[PDB]
Paper text:
MGME1 (also known as DDK1) is a highly conserved, mitochondria-specific DNase. Human MGME1 (HsMGME1) protein is composed of 344 amino acids and belongs to the PD-(D/E)XK nuclease superfamily. However, in contrast to DNA2 (2–5) and many other mitochondrial DNases, MGME1 can cleave various types of DNA substrates with a preference for single-stranded DNAs (ssDNA). Structural analysis and comparison suggest that MGME1 follows a two-cation-assisted catalytic mechanism of substrate cleavage.
To test our hypothesis, we constructed one HsMGME1 mutant with His180 substituted by Gln180, which is similar to His180 in size but neutral in charge. Using this H180Q mutant, we successfully solved one HsMGME1 ternary complex structure, H180Q–ssDNA2–Ca2+. One six-coordinated Ca2+ ion was bound at the active site of HsMGME1. Beside Ca2+-coordination, water molecule W1 also forms one H-bond (2.6 Å) with the side chain NZ atom of Lys253. The residue Gln180 does not coordinate Ca2+; compared with His180 in the HsMGME1–Mn2+ structure, the side chain of Gln180 is rotated clockwise around the CA-CB bond for about 150° in the H180Q-ssDNA2-Ca2+ complex. Though they are not identical in coordination, the orientations of the Ca2+ and the A-site Mn2+ are very similar in the H180Q-ssDNA2-Ca2+ and HsMGME1–Mn2+ structures. As indicated by the very low root mean square deviation value (rmsd, 0.7 Å), the overall structure of H180Q–ssDNA2–Ca2+ is very similar to that of the HsMGME1–ssDNA2 complex. Though one Ca2+ ion was bound at the A-binding site, the B-binding site was not occupied by any cations in the H180Q–ssDNA2–Ca2+ complex, which may have weakened the overall DNA coordinating ability of Ca2+ and led to the shifting of the A5 nucleotide.
Residue numbers in the entry: 129 to 188, 197 to 333
The structure:
Amino acid sequence: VIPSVTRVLQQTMTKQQVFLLERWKQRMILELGEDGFKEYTSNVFLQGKRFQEALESILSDENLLKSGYIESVQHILKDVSGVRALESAVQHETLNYIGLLDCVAEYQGKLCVIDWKTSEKPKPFIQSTFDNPLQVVAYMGAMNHDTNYSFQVQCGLIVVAYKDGSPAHPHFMDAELCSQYWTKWLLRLEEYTEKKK
DNA sequence: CAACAA
Ligand SMILES: [Ca+2]
Ligand SMILES: [Ca+2]
Protein backbone atom coordinates (compact mmCIF):
# COMPACT_ATOMS: atom_id res chain seq x y z
CA VAL A 1 0.00 0.00 0.00
CA ILE A 2 1.06 3.62 -0.57
CA PRO A 3 1.40 5.73 2.61
CA SER A 4 -0.71 8.78 3.43
CA VAL A 5 0.35 12.10 4.94
CA THR A 6 -1.28 11.93 8.38
CA ARG A 7 -0.08 8.31 8.60
CA VAL A 8 3.57 9.07 7.78
CA LEU A 9 3.70 11.74 10.50
CA GLN A 10 1.91 9.93 13.33
CA GLN A 11 4.33 7.00 12.90
CA THR A 12 7.44 9.22 12.93
CA MET A 13 6.75 11.27 16.06
CA THR A 14 9.60 11.92 18.45
CA LYS A 15 9.87 10.04 21.74
CA GLN A 16 8.82 13.23 23.55
CA GLN A 17 5.71 13.56 21.37
CA VAL A 18 4.42 10.05 22.12
CA PHE A 19 5.12 10.52 25.84
CA LEU A 20 3.15 13.75 26.23
CA LEU A 21 0.23 12.33 24.22
CA GLU A 22 -0.19 8.92 25.87
CA ARG A 23 0.31 10.54 29.30
CA TRP A 24 -2.43 13.09 28.61
CA LYS A 25 -4.55 10.27 27.20
CA GLN A 26 -4.27 8.04 30.28
CA ARG A 27 -5.02 11.06 32.48
CA MET A 28 -8.28 11.41 30.53
CA ILE A 29 -8.93 7.67 30.84
CA LEU A 30 -8.31 8.05 34.58
CA GLU A 31 -10.67 10.96 35.20
CA LEU A 32 -13.39 9.68 32.88
CA GLY A 33 -12.89 6.01 31.93
CA GLU A 34 -12.29 3.76 28.92
CA ASP A 35 -16.00 3.86 28.06
CA GLY A 36 -16.32 7.62 27.73
CA PHE A 37 -12.81 8.65 26.65
CA LYS A 38 -13.47 6.82 23.42
CA GLU A 39 -16.77 8.72 23.39
CA TYR A 40 -14.91 12.00 23.97
CA THR A 41 -12.55 11.43 21.03
CA SER A 42 -15.57 10.38 18.95
CA ASN A 43 -17.20 13.74 19.67
CA VAL A 44 -13.86 15.51 19.16
CA PHE A 45 -13.37 13.91 15.74
CA LEU A 46 -16.97 14.60 14.75
CA GLN A 47 -16.88 18.38 15.21
CA GLY A 48 -13.69 18.66 13.18
CA LYS A 49 -15.30 16.91 10.21
CA ARG A 50 -18.57 18.85 10.48
CA PHE A 51 -16.71 22.18 10.61
CA GLN A 52 -14.92 21.34 7.48
CA GLU A 53 -18.08 20.00 5.87
CA ALA A 54 -19.92 23.17 6.88
CA LEU A 55 -17.47 25.58 5.24
CA GLU A 56 -17.44 23.38 2.12
CA SER A 57 -21.04 24.56 1.69
CA ILE A 58 -19.91 28.18 2.23
CA LEU A 59 -17.15 28.22 -0.38
CA SER A 60 -19.50 26.08 -2.54
CA ASP A 61 -27.18 28.09 16.58
CA GLU A 62 -27.17 24.38 15.74
CA ASN A 63 -28.29 21.61 18.13
CA LEU A 64 -24.83 21.26 19.66
CA LEU A 65 -23.06 24.35 20.97
CA LYS A 66 -20.20 23.69 18.55
CA SER A 67 -21.58 26.56 16.43
CA GLY A 68 -18.73 28.79 17.64
CA TYR A 69 -16.32 27.24 15.12
CA ILE A 70 -17.73 29.02 12.08
CA GLU A 71 -18.37 32.31 13.87
CA SER A 72 -14.73 32.01 14.98
CA VAL A 73 -13.68 31.83 11.32
CA GLN A 74 -15.84 34.53 9.68
CA HIS A 75 -13.06 37.11 10.06
CA ILE A 76 -10.94 34.61 8.09
CA LEU A 77 -13.48 34.01 5.34
CA LYS A 78 -13.70 37.77 4.79
CA ASP A 79 -10.22 37.41 3.23
CA VAL A 80 -10.73 34.09 1.40
CA SER A 81 -11.37 34.48 -2.34
CA GLY A 82 -10.96 32.77 -5.70
CA VAL A 83 -11.62 29.23 -4.50
CA ARG A 84 -10.07 26.71 -6.86
CA ALA A 85 -10.39 23.39 -5.11
CA LEU A 86 -11.90 21.70 -2.09
CA GLU A 87 -11.16 18.31 -0.57
CA SER A 88 -8.82 17.04 -3.19
CA ALA A 89 -6.98 13.77 -3.27
CA VAL A 90 -3.37 14.39 -4.11
CA GLN A 91 -0.91 12.02 -5.79
CA HIS A 92 2.87 12.36 -5.65
CA GLU A 93 4.46 10.62 -8.63
CA THR A 94 8.02 10.85 -7.28
CA LEU A 95 8.10 10.37 -3.50
CA ASN A 96 5.04 8.07 -3.58
CA TYR A 97 2.52 9.26 -0.98
CA ILE A 98 -1.10 10.37 -0.99
CA GLY A 99 -3.16 12.94 0.87
CA LEU A 100 -6.53 14.71 1.01
CA LEU A 101 -6.23 18.47 1.54
CA ASP A 102 -9.15 20.58 2.74
CA CYS A 103 -9.25 23.22 0.01
CA VAL A 104 -7.18 25.46 -2.26
CA ALA A 105 -8.12 29.13 -2.43
CA GLU A 106 -6.73 32.66 -2.34
CA TYR A 107 -6.33 34.16 1.14
CA GLN A 108 -5.48 37.87 1.13
CA GLY A 109 -4.93 37.58 -2.62
CA LYS A 110 -2.25 34.88 -2.29
CA LEU A 111 -3.12 31.40 -3.54
CA CYS A 112 -2.42 28.85 -0.81
CA VAL A 113 -3.43 25.44 0.52
CA ILE A 114 -5.81 25.97 3.44
CA ASP A 115 -6.26 23.39 6.21
CA TRP A 116 -9.04 24.06 8.72
CA LYS A 117 -8.51 22.96 12.32
CA THR A 118 -10.75 22.87 15.37
CA SER A 119 -9.15 23.19 18.80
CA GLU A 120 -10.27 23.79 22.37
CA LYS A 121 -6.88 25.24 23.36
CA PRO A 122 -5.76 28.48 21.67
CA LYS A 123 -2.83 28.21 19.24
CA PRO A 124 -1.35 31.71 18.85
CA PHE A 125 1.94 30.28 17.55
CA ILE A 126 2.55 27.91 14.66
CA GLN A 127 4.70 25.90 17.08
CA SER A 128 1.47 25.21 18.99
CA THR A 129 0.05 23.42 15.92
CA PHE A 130 2.67 20.63 16.25
CA ASP A 131 3.00 18.81 12.87
CA ASN A 132 0.28 20.85 11.13
CA PRO A 133 2.72 22.76 8.83
CA LEU A 134 4.37 19.52 7.70
CA GLN A 135 0.88 18.21 6.92
CA VAL A 136 0.21 21.30 4.80
CA VAL A 137 3.52 21.34 2.92
CA ALA A 138 3.10 17.62 2.29
CA TYR A 139 -0.24 18.36 0.62
CA MET A 140 1.19 21.11 -1.59
CA GLY A 141 4.22 19.08 -2.66
CA ALA A 142 1.90 16.20 -3.54
CA MET A 143 -0.65 18.29 -5.46
CA ASN A 144 2.19 20.08 -7.24
CA HIS A 145 3.87 16.79 -8.25
CA ASP A 146 0.57 15.50 -9.59
CA THR A 147 -0.96 14.54 -12.93
CA ASN A 148 -4.49 15.68 -12.07
CA TYR A 149 -4.11 19.40 -11.35
CA SER A 150 -3.61 22.43 -13.58
CA PHE A 151 -1.84 24.81 -11.19
CA GLN A 152 0.97 24.83 -8.64
CA VAL A 153 0.79 26.59 -5.28
CA GLN A 154 3.62 27.89 -3.11
CA CYS A 155 2.08 29.12 0.16
CA GLY A 156 0.04 27.39 2.85
CA LEU A 157 -2.39 28.42 5.54
CA ILE A 158 -3.40 26.79 8.82
CA VAL A 159 -6.48 28.18 10.55
CA VAL A 160 -7.39 27.14 14.09
CA ALA A 161 -11.08 27.65 14.85
CA TYR A 162 -12.28 27.64 18.45
CA LYS A 163 -15.52 26.26 19.84
CA ASP A 164 -16.25 29.35 21.97
CA GLY A 165 -16.36 31.74 18.99
CA SER A 166 -13.02 33.38 19.78
CA PRO A 167 -11.17 34.95 16.82
CA ALA A 168 -9.57 32.05 14.97
CA HIS A 169 -5.81 32.08 14.47
CA PRO A 170 -4.63 32.19 10.83
CA HIS A 171 -1.09 30.81 10.48
CA PHE A 172 -0.04 31.90 7.00
CA MET A 173 3.17 30.41 5.57
CA ASP A 174 4.96 32.18 2.71
CA ALA A 175 7.06 30.51 0.02
CA GLU A 176 10.30 30.37 2.01
CA LEU A 177 8.80 29.09 5.27
CA CYS A 178 7.02 26.34 3.32
CA SER A 179 10.37 25.37 1.78
CA GLN A 180 12.00 24.82 5.18
CA TYR A 181 9.05 22.87 6.59
CA TRP A 182 9.06 20.86 3.36
CA THR A 183 12.57 19.48 3.88
CA LYS A 184 11.60 18.76 7.50
CA TRP A 185 8.67 16.84 6.03
CA LEU A 186 11.02 15.33 3.43
CA LEU A 187 12.98 13.86 6.34
CA ARG A 188 9.86 12.60 8.17
CA LEU A 189 8.86 10.84 4.95
CA GLU A 190 12.18 8.97 4.91
CA GLU A 191 12.24 7.76 8.53
CA TYR A 192 8.90 6.15 7.70
CA THR A 193 10.11 4.44 4.52
CA GLU A 194 13.34 3.47 6.30
CA LYS A 195 11.15 1.98 9.05
CA LYS A 196 9.51 -0.26 6.42
CA LYS A 197 12.68 -1.60 4.77
C1' DC B 1 -8.02 9.37 4.46
C1' DA B 2 -9.32 11.90 8.10
C1' DA B 3 -11.10 14.18 12.25
C1' DC B 4 -7.74 15.82 17.68
C1' DA B 5 -5.11 15.08 21.53
C1' DA B 6 0.46 17.35 23.51
CA1 LIG C 1 -8.37 20.07 8.23
CA1 LIG D 1 -0.45 19.12 -11.19
